[PDB]
């Protein structure tokens with residue numbers, strides 16, 4: 148089928164892209180080299196202007212890139228990207244310069260940012276690091292302002308997710324352990 | 339049916355209780371008064387010893403209790419607790435001393451802690467605040483060590499979730515906005 152239709156997400160609603168707690172892909176660029184890893188420990192931090200947290204282990208090449216550039220992208224992978232997600236979270240760029248081609252990661256650029264975005268995801272958030280030395284050293288905890296947000300309109304539009312009507316393979320992934328994840332499920336509305 | 343069977347969760351696996359990013363209930367006690375609120379912005383922070391983050395707005399009575407006592411419980415509500423979850427997140431104890439009875443919250447105590455635990459949840463994590471003045475003031479961001487963890491063995495046992503085999507109403511809730519949540523869904527295993 149046709150290319151996914153990407154639309155901007157009003158910045159004040161960007162937090163909704165992560166509210167259900169999906170496992171994400173973290174991408175970054177440093178000195179012209181791109182990288183992508185998996186992160187379960189990424190959480191919204193504020194609404195307006197949007198902010199988020201992400202925990203990045205000291206062993207990761209992606210953390211190094213973020214420390215050097217101060218910018219990254221958080222993006223929401225799909226069930227179709229199950230293998231990609233696990234692979235980028237099981238291999239380090241430090242061990243193979245061809246990580247991205249090995250993991251099946253296709254990158255693109257968007258909105259004049261000097262950043263890599265992962266093709267096939269449901270949503271993307273461009274992030275500017277707010278440096279916090281103590282948090283980063285003591286807790287591996289990084290805070291960023293979300294400066295731009297976009298999503299595939301078949302699965303997120305007008306400020307809401309539509310997993311129930313979108314193709315099943317666009318559901319978000321929610322990691323537990325090993326190679327095991329849960330896809331997001333059924334919609335419920337409180338009275 | 340029978341009472342849920344509660345077992346301790348090995349502390350080194352406690353992070354798995356939150357890995358899929360559920361919306362949680364935050365409970366706390368101060369000067370003998372208990373409170374419960376809803377928090378979507380709660381995320382694992384470390385594995386061993388376990389730690390977590392939670393974002394608590396300055397307007398919340400629960401935040402006050404946490405600041406005063408330095409202790410709280412993070413617990414994972416179920417689809418059966420859809421109304422309870424939305425209600426405790428839509429009403430403040432500051433406005434009605436009877437919040438808990440209004441919201442249908444049944445509390446219990448566990449493992450000699452001076453803490454309130456919410457009956458009917460799938461999992462509970464006892465937390466000790468690690469005070470971080472700047473994070474708490476600037477970002478409403480609270481860090482805690484997880485000192486104890488337990489779960490309903492029908493839905494989490496031997497370090498793994500079993501949503502696929504447990505009753506559907508024990509699935510976790512993943513908030514988006516308004517009264518709308520998604521339940522956790524189908525299990526997937528990477529190759």
Ligand SMILES: Cc1cc2nc3c(=O)[nH]c(=O)nc-3n(C[C@H](O)[C@H](O)[C@H](O)COP(=O)(O)O)c2cc1C
Nearest residue numbers: 184185186187188203204207208209236238239240
């Ligand atoms: C599903 C999944 C979730 C993960 N979550 C995190 C996380 O939240 N933080 C982190 O530092 N590493 C996490 N990891 C591990 C990194 O993705 C992994 O170490 C990766 O190989 C780092 O790649 P890099 O060194 O090329 O940056 C996760 C891995 C997987 C498979």
Ligand SMILES: Cc1cc2nc3c(=O)[nH]c(=O)nc-3n(C[C@H](O)[C@H](O)[C@H](O)COP(=O)(O)O)c2cc1C
Nearest residue numbers: 375376377378379394395398399400427429430431
């Ligand atoms: C589903 C849901 C998720 C929520 N997430 C958060 C959160 O992460 N942090 C926060 O401070 N408030 C959050 N809220 C709002 C609080 O739960 C709400 O302000 C509550 O009434 C506070 O109660 P209290 O003042 O009695 O402590 C959420 C509400 C709902 C319904």
